[PDB]
Amino acid sequence: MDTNKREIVEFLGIRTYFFPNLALYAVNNDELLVSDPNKANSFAAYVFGASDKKPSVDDIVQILFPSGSDSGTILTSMDTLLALGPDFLTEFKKRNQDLARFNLTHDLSILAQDEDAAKKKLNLMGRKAKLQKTEAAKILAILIKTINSEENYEKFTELSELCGLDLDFDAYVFTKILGLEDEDTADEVEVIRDNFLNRLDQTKPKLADIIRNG
Amino acid sequence: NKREIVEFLGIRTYFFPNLALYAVNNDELLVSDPNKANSFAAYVFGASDKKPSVDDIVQILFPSGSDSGTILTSMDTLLALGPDFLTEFKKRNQDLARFNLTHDLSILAQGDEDAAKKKLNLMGRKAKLQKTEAAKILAILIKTINSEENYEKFTELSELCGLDLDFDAYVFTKILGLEDEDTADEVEVIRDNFLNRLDQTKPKLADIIRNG
């Protein structure tokens, strides 16, 4: 969107900040994901349980940055790249370089530009952001806490805060793509999954059925 | 017996309903003659620098004639205030047993504290993922109980602001001494969040918090 603001969007029961084009894809293509998942998008097929083939980095980047993406789409998807960790940081820097010609930049560019000191400054920034009363500030706080997490369990704990903004879909997608479900987190992942399924059961039962079954 | 947030004329609270009522009922006193006001209220609202006693706090949390819901809510407050209030918590819980009532976190007051806290940690993490205020309050309470140091306690109590329970976070900060060089900027945000609401109903009382 032609805005710099972090905004939650929704598509037919799927509320999302980090993955709007994935949500839209799934809403449009649910019958294809049921009936011929190998011809469907591999990121969507994996997330929704239609395929056990993990998407590539390229598959993910393509969904995050479709052709004709505007500045708000790019900046939002750059947040997603940061949350996705080191395999996506070179892509983040590329997208940030592209924006500079337009006098645009990612607001957390201090990371990519003494990372320890940036992360401590960001830690304080995120703690104050969370105390603000807006969704945009709370998303920023969760992003910072996720970036500053060192191990998977901490990262899962901080991403789980997305469920407090009814962003269970995003927490679920990150859990799937980053491999955060293990013996310690499994019961909590099940609650997150069930929160998302509770919304899906009302709008896209086919998608719910794939996630539950196959 | 459900955990229910309440409000008194601009003061939204879970943990301190009788403190909020006291402020509604003694507005003028706190603004105009605070040396005559209740010491816990006077301290919280910035009218006095004298810290309240344990008994002062307990009497506001458990007024004479308190019913079982009031008792159970205030026992949550005792647990959040920490080990200094555990003997009071156990006494209140023992008295409830005759009526077939108990606090739902009674395992804390029994054997093996460490094992109970590990079990409560997992329950709190699942509770926070539920979509109700009652479950989210339980999760914050557990996370506070399981915090050892002031900074961690402050971080977990700050989550009350996500339920617009800034008043409660502010009261706990005042009573537990959580404001220091590391937390002062965040305490100011929490205070201002509460005052932004209090300004709409009792601006002269909000002014005492700002200015003494």
Numbering used by the authors:
A (entry chain C): 1 to 113, 115 to 215
B (entry chain A): 4 to 215
Can you provide the manuscript's text about this entry?
We determined the Caenorhabditis japonica PGL-1 NtDD crystal structure to 1.5 Å. The NtDD has a novel fold consisting of 11 alpha helices and a single N-terminal beta strand. The asymmetric unit (ASU) was composed of four NtDD domains, which were structurally similar (RMSD 0.219–0.254, C-alpha chains B-D aligned to C-alpha A) except amino acid G114, and the first three N-terminal residues could not be visualized in all of the copies of the ASU. The complexity and conservation of these interactions suggested biological relevance. We conclude that the dimers observed in the crystal structure represent the NtDD dimer detected in solution. Therefore, PGL proteins possess two dimerization domains. Based on insights from the NtDD structure, we designed two distinct PGL-1 mutant proteins that are unable to dimerize in vitro and are severely compromised in vivo for assembly into P granules and fertility.
Two PGL proteins, PGL-1 and PGL-3, are key scaffolding proteins required for proper P granule assembly. PGL proteins can self-assemble into granules, both in vitro using purified recombinant protein9,11,12 and in intestinal nematode cells or mammalian cells in culture when expressed on their own. Assays for granule assembly in mammalian cells implicated the conserved N-terminal region of PGL as critical, and structural studies identified a central dimerization domain (DD) within that conserved region.
